[PDB]
Design a protein around this ligand. Structure first.
Ligand code: NCD
Ligand code: NCD
Ligand code: ZN
Ligand code: ZN
Ligand code: ZN
Ligand code: ZN
Lengths: 362, 362
């Protein structure tokens, strides 16, 4: 007997198109999404060219409309030069992404004053997400309060970070956050097996105490999001390994295993992969869309999943219980038992739907 | 220029059918809902007969399907005799309602052991809401922890209650809550004008400090809900006045006034009248459904609103800014500038929709 879930949403993926299409493209990344029970993705802007102005966004929109197999929204990225220039296209994006630490990106902001400028000029009703680690979480929360608006913290990975966010929420501050599966299911104990190249990720893998702190503070976690960050094995094992793990195809099976073990409820999972993503990013419903999962099937994660061009996974050898059997997207069968059945281009930009615009005061 | 909102949801209404149809019926109450920008309502079970067993639910379903103009779900009510008997129909209801204090209801539970029995026998994946005032909020939270599940607190009205819920949320406990408009916009200062009959409501009107505490702790409030509780003026002004205010037609105009004054944001309002109702009660989206409001129009609340059979309102004479211009429900114009344009019976039971069932483990 299968369980029917709504269409799940991943608010943090890297689809690498344009400019890194040997790692992933819209067609291969959205195939990975559908196979992981994900029917809508929000794509980060750290591509080549990065999505930091209107021409780059226009190019990315057309590439996604032609290649995506599931529905999507595209983030804009903050730069040292584009504050105050995005007003005409801001509403067409998933939100604005601030890169506040070192990671796979050249979108460096090197002064808090630049963060302030973005918080002041970006329209106040639209989402802002931040790559902000350790004390940077406190710093960006300060900038959000100075400018009297909300912020969403990407991939929280540490006891320090989740407890700071917990304290902010207790004071009534408008902050939300997401946690990626590798920070719930991997730790320092796995670095010997992975090695220093494969093991490179930002935020880095945490201690066992970090992992335990995230589970203990699940009530503080608003969303799960994969931070699907594909790189080839050659790149991961080469002289200057880029950080990041692929994760779309393994996220839901890992979390279904935890549900089966009683670590969180099915509702806890659906809040964090459906309802809270919808409400934080004002993402629209998807008509006639659902995911059927088999919670009984036991299997072991192989050395690579079928669809991501990354062609490797850090979860190799983990035993999971739960698998995606079928996905229906807007009335068409999109995935069944390892076969993707919608072509590149089937997916649409949800911000162009009338119900996908963020409401605002005139 | 109008602002387009999604279809708003009121998780706490009394439609009085069956058995009190001089006060309201499905047709008049859902007309009031549409005029207030509400496209989906959850109807409480304290009717005559009350909805406390399968035959009563079956009757109510048919009355609602024939009379409702907007979509709906129907609560079941807990009684001193029906714990352990609702399993076959539980999934067809909005949730289970516990009456834990004195109010317009004979569904008295007179022992905490009866509360325990309901929390243990009601399916653990389905909603429970509680009428629980003052220390009763702490008591029902204790029962929820003993039985390891969530609870939703109806119409929070006091500083004492919102601060207790705030403390529970800080400890990670699964509790949500709703606040009704009369507890944000009326107080003891209005009791002289209303008089002792009209002024009767449960929870009673609060002090100015109670009202200020609710606004200061808006981050703790998950939902707004009208607690639309219609009684005729004759009843309100007679020898034994029943408690309750009508509120569907005045809720959104009052809150839009507050938005216009900067007391909360448009997003704050849509979280509390759309996204959080959806996610707490697992309510489905409504296709091709939206509400158009005019935020500029200034007007004064009259002595009665056009649609509710209550034919009175406690907000008479309050100046508001904001009004509902048009409502579209599932592709049909349902309301325009004071005219309801869908007939009784247009509305549907959302728990019969495939997307309206609450997901559960097999
Ligand atoms: N997380 C990573 O380690 N890498 C991400 C970037 C990011 O999310 O910071 C990537 O784009 O490769
Ligand atoms: N709130 C009230 O004062 N009355 C409600 C019942 C309730 O919500 O307790 C009614 O049904 O009249
Ligand atoms: Zn990042
Ligand atoms: Zn990322
Ligand atoms: Zn009540
Ligand atoms: Zn009520």
């Amino acid at each position: 007997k299968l369980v029917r879930l709504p269409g799940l949403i991943d608010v943090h993926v890297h689809l690498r198109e344009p400019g890194g299409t040997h790692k992933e493209d819209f067609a291969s990344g959205t195939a990975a999404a559908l196979a992981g029970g994900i029917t809508m993705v929000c794509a980060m802007p750290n591509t080549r060219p990065p999505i930091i102005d209107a021409p780059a966004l226009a190019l990315a929109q057309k590439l996604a409309e032609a290649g995506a197999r599931c529905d999507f929204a595209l983030f804009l990225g903050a730069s040292s030069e584009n504050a105050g220039t995005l007003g005409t296209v801001a509403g067409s994006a998933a939100g604005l992404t601030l890169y506040l630490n070192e990671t796979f990106s050249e979108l460096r902001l090197d002064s808090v004053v630049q963060w302030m400028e973005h918080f002041e000029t970006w329209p106040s009703h639209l989402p802002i997400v931040a790559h902000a680690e350790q004390q940077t979480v406190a710093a960006v929360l300060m900038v959000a309060q100075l400018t009297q608006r909300s912020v969403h913290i990407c991939h929280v990975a540490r006891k320090e970070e989740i407890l700071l966010i917990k304290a902010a929420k207790a004071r009534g501050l408008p902050v939300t956050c997401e946690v990626a599966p590798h920070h719930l299911f991997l730790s320092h104990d796995d670095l010997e097996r992975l090695g220093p190249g494969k093991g490179e990720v930002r935020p880095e893998l945490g201690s066992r105490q970090d992992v335990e702190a995230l589970w203990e503070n699940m009530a503080v976690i608003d969303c799960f999001a994969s931070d699907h960050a594909p790189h080839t094995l050659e790149e991961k094992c080469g002289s200057r390994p880029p950080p990041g793990f692929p994760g779309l195809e393994t996220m839901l099976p890992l979390l279904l295993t935890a549900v089966s073990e009683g670590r969180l409820s099915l509702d806890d999972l659906l809040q964090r992969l459906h309802h809270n993503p919808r409400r934080i990013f004002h993402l629209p419903p998807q008509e006639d869309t659902y995911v059927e999962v088999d919670l009984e099937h036991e299997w072991t994660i192989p050395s690579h999943m079928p669809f991501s061009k990354a062609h490797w996974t850090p979860f190799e050898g983990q035993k999971v219980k739960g698998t995606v059997r079928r996905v229906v997207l807007r009335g068409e069968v999109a995935y069944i038992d390892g076969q993707v059945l919608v072509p590149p281009g089937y997916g649409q930009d949800v911000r162009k739907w009338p119900q996908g615009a963020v409401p605002q005061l005139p």
